[PDB]
Structures are given as C-alpha cells and as structure tokens.
Amino acid sequence: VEWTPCRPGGALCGKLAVPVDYDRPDGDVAALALIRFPATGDKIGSLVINPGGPGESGIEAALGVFQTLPKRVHERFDLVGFDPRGVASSRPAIWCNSDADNDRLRAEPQVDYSREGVAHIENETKQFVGRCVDKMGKNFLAHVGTVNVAKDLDAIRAALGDDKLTYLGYSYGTRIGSAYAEEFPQRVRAMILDGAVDPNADPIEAELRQAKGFQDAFNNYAADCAKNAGCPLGADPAKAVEVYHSLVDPLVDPDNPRISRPARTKDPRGLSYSDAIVGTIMALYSPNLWQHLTDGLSELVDNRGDTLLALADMYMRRDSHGRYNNSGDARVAINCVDQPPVTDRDKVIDEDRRAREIAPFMSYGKFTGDAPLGTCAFWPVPPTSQPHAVSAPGLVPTVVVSTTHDPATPYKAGVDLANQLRGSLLTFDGTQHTVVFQGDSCIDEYVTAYLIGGTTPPSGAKC
Structure with a gap:
C-alpha cells in the first residue's frame, strides 16, 4: 500500500x-x-x-x-x-437505486399488507434486484x-x-x-x-428478537419521557404505544392504506408514516437521540414532522442535497449472500403475525393474513455462507x-x-x-x- x-x-x-x-x-x-x-x-x-x-x-x-x-x-x-x-x-461500489428511487420508496406508507399491497411491495423488490444486476453484474454481487x-x-x-x-x-x-x-x-x-x-441464529427468530429489542427500547425511552414535562407520549408509559399511534397513524389515509398524508415539514417531502417509523427506530439506537425523538413527536402533535424526517435521513444516509451514500444498497447485497434467504410464504406470514404482537409500536392496523417476502428471497446469486x-x-x-x-x-x-x-x-x-x-x-x-x-x-x- x-x-x-x-x-x-x-x-x-x-x-x-x-x-x-x-x-x-x-x-x-x-x-x-x-x-x-x-x-x-x-x-x-x-x-x-x-x-x-x-x-x-x-x-x-x-x-x-x-x-x-x-x-x-x-x-x-x-x-x-x-x-x-x-x-x-x-x-x-455497490449501487442499485437512484436517489429518486430511494425517495420514491420512502414516500410510500409501506403499510398495506393486503394481497394488492404485497404484490406492490414484491414488484418493487423485483425491480430493485433487477437494477442491482444491471449496474453490478452477477459476478461482483456473488462475491x-x-x-x-x-x-x-x-x-x-x-x-x-x-x-x-x-x-x-x-x-x-x-x-x-x-x-x-x-x-x-x-x-x-x-x-x-x-x-x-x-x-x-435462525434468521426469523433473530428478526423477532430484534423487533422485541426495539419495542423494549421504546418502552424504556417512553418510561423516561413520562417523567419529563410535556411528554408527547403522555405521563402513563402503559399507554405510550397507543399515544404514539395516535400521532403517526394519521400520516396514513384511514380509508386507503396506500395514501400518504405526510406531516408538514420545511423540506418538500414532508413526513410519511414509513419515515416516521424509521426515524423512531434510528433514535432508539442511543439515549443521545431520545431528546430528538421527543422533539419529533411533539412536532407531530402539531402535524409537523421535521425532526423525524431528519432522523430517518440520518438512518437512510441522505445528505442535505438529497444524495444518498451507497450503504443502503450495499447492506442488502451483503446481507443477501451471508445466509440462505427465507422463501417460505407461510413462515414469512407467521413472522408478521408474531411481530405485530411483539412490537406494536411498529405495526399498523391489524394482521391481514398476508406479508411480503424480503428482498433476499429474490436474490439472483446464492448464499456464500450459512448459519x-x-x-x-x-x-x-x-x-x-x-x-x-x-x-x-x-x-x-x-x-x-x-x-x-x-x-x-x-x-x-x-x-x-x-x-x-x-x-x-x-x-x-x-x-x-x-x-x-x-x-x-x-x-x-x-x-
């Protein structure tokens, strides 16, 4: 060197x-x-x-x-x-999505798990895997x-x-x-x-343990906040999940899961439901970000979403000129080859059933009986490792x-x-x-x- x-x-x-x-x-x-x-x-x-x-x-x-x-x-x-x-x-460098591709996904509530919903998500995934193979070729992706x-x-x-x-x-x-x-x-x-x-680890059980992890961090953040003046989740931490949903659920049209009703922001995008969840998840990596989450939620009380949008951007690695780094695209490509993907519909549907119960702060509405496959179920290149x-x-x-x-x-x-x-x-x-x-x-x-x-x-x- x-x-x-x-x-x-x-x-x-x-x-x-x-x-x-x-x-x-x-x-x-x-x-x-x-x-x-x-x-x-x-x-x-x-x-x-x-x-x-x-x-x-x-x-x-x-x-x-x-x-x-x-x-x-x-x-x-x-x-x-x-x-x-x-x-x-x-x-x-691994690249699949344009900046616009990423933006377009993040605008969607990504919350409709009806059959039409699942077909929509799964169609986007196929197009994504196609953009990967197109830009990278199967050989680089394989290794x-x-x-x-x-x-x-x-x-x-x-x-x-x-x-x-x-x-x-x-x-x-x-x-x-x-x-x-x-x-x-x-x-x-x-x-x-x-x-x-x-x-x-079994990939599904690990996912469900990770969901439990974040629901517990949510529980912890919210118990902390409940002791603080003007907690946007309320003074009763047993009701924080519900209060949280009274703040984010309206970002989704009540008669049509596919319609975003974003909170107002200084940025043109506004705040979608999906970005609201992502920003929340981001803040739960560290108590250093709990103040920000509390700000983001107070904003929501006024139908504002600037802080939660900025948290989701941090997670998503989107700079202020709207340019993404390749971490999102690389993450998937690397994850997809590190183990065999879950391709069984029933297991995937059952995970969603269980996830809605383990991590309600993350789930919207009711179990539908359907759930999408992950991106990895569609990978054109086989796992180079195995649990x-x-x-x-x-x-x-x-x-x-x-x-x-x-x-x-x-x-x-x-x-x-x-x-x-x-x-x-x-x-x-x-x-x-x-x-x-x-x-x-x-x-x-x-x-x-x-x-x-x-x-x-x-x-x-x-x-």
Whole structure:
C-alpha cells in the first residue's frame, strides 16, 4: 500500500487490490480504500476497526472513533479503518437505486399488507434486484459476502505489516470478526466484538428478537419521557404505544392504506408514516437521540414532522442535497449472500403475525393474513455462507461486549457469541446499540487493558 496524506489527523490514505473472486485470483480486481492514524508512541501494530451495517464505511468510522480513542490506545496503535469490498470508497461500489428511487420508496406508507399491497411491495423488490444486476453484474454481487471480506481482512493485515490482527468490530462487524476468527485463527492477536451477531441464529427468530429489542427500547425511552414535562407520549408509559399511534397513524389515509398524508415539514417531502417509523427506530439506537425523538413527536402533535424526517435521513444516509451514500444498497447485497434467504410464504406470514404482537409500536392496523417476502428471497446469486456455531478452537481469548437492552443486537446474542468463541462477556447496562470508545470510561478501561496487556475482563464483569 502506497500511503498518501488525506484529501483531520495525521491521516494517511491508500488502496489495496484484492481479487473479486478468490478462486480466480488473476481475474477482476477490487480496490479497497484504507485510512490510517499512526500511533503517537511505541507501536504494537494496527488497530483495525469496522462499524458494521453492512454498507457502513470504516474510513468514516475511524474518523469518528479517532476523536474518542483513549490516549493509551492511540499511543500504542495505528488506528486503521477500511471500506469493505463494494462499500463507500472501495471500487467498484455497490449501487442499485437512484436517489429518486430511494425517495420514491420512502414516500410510500409501506403499510398495506393486503394481497394488492404485497404484490406492490414484491414488484418493487423485483425491480430493485433487477437494477442491482444491471449496474453490478452477477459476478461482483456473488462475491461481496462476509466470507470474502474475511479474506480481504487477512490481505489488509499483511499489507499493514502486522503478523497478527488486532480488530474491533461493531454490530455486523462482529460477523466479519467471527468469520475471520474461523478462517485465520492463528492470525488473531486480539479481538473485541461489540454488539454481537450470532451466526448460528435462525434468521426469523433473530428478526423477532430484534423487533422485541426495539419495542423494549421504546418502552424504556417512553418510561423516561413520562417523567419529563410535556411528554408527547403522555405521563402513563402503559399507554405510550397507543399515544404514539395516535400521532403517526394519521400520516396514513384511514380509508386507503396506500395514501400518504405526510406531516408538514420545511423540506418538500414532508413526513410519511414509513419515515416516521424509521426515524423512531434510528433514535432508539442511543439515549443521545431520545431528546430528538421527543422533539419529533411533539412536532407531530402539531402535524409537523421535521425532526423525524431528519432522523430517518440520518438512518437512510441522505445528505442535505438529497444524495444518498451507497450503504443502503450495499447492506442488502451483503446481507443477501451471508445466509440462505427465507422463501417460505407461510413462515414469512407467521413472522408478521408474531411481530405485530411483539412490537406494536411498529405495526399498523391489524394482521391481514398476508406479508411480503424480503428482498433476499429474490436474490439472483446464492448464499456464500450459512448459519452455524462458530468453531475456532485455537482462537486467542477474545472480548464480546454486550449491552443489556441493545435493540439492534440483543444482549443474549452477545452471550451466545462469547460462548461459541469461548471468550469473555463484558456486560454494559444500558439501552443502546454498542458502547466501546463512546464515552464510558469503565468499558474503555477494560478494552484498553485487553488491547495492550492482553488482559481479559473477569467473569461477570459489568460496566
């Protein structure tokens, strides 16, 4: 890797070629983008991070993380982020939707699960999969999965001059981690997995656990807000879900589920029901955003939706010129190849039945007896991985950080990952998704000690 300064730190940027198909090593090539913040003291090696998603840029993440890196870590490690194959600055980038495509979807309430509804959604999905194949070709799409990102990660380790890998992975990044752990166990110096993905999970049950996670974060946010003056969800947290629906349900035409009646906003779009739900989900990643949710809901009381629109934009990664980054398109393409998709109609219909009961804050009206297949049921390229218990017997002891009320990657998933990995569980008591290098000096203390000294947290370490 020829490094160059970056066109906000001591930052150096560079590229790395990897083969698109590893079985055809001298074929098409991808250029992975890399950023590096050199260590200030005695360098142990590079701390390579990944934010997850998938579709999330590691370069962007390293820039953020840089501001909150502890001084002992920054002394001893190059902070290094990278964009996985097909993501962000890596070429070729995954793209399916135009900016207009994304906008057009987000304007729809996406709430009608009648047969006509389901046919509509499923038709949009086919057109989406078509735009993917059109712009990317089936070969690149076939090899964007974690199984090959794991292999890129070893190339990155090597290219960085490290004998063994020191890795911090958040969320989906914990899948990269455990995958790398299984293929290159003898190359792992240290590894922290914060916000855990259990590769052995049933996809449907995981989804339903994630729905439960967000409904509980909703419960927690609303109980908090109920103690506060002028809570837009009311002073009785047992009624917050209903009150929430009295605020968002009118964004859908009562006699016709397909008609959006958006709340007024300074932006031309206004706020659709779907964007209202998305912005809510976004705010529930972190208590840091609870104030914003409370603002967004107070706005709704006046038929305004500016803050919720801005939250959904944050989630959707839409800048203020209405341009999207490719994280949405990459996320799907990568998710779709990491496991076999659910194609059974009945299971999909049953999940919806169960989801409406587990997470009412998210569901609109009544169970209809029908539900759409996910985008992955229509993928033109087969899964390059498959659910299994992580098995990496000689793996160095790793640290899994799991948060008690994490809506995105629930606590138990952290427990199970640590189990399979035979590593350490460090609990964070909180209602948020991930926590490492995000202000909590206790967590950071354990993580610093593990990174430098190799010292794992004691059994039952809580923080």
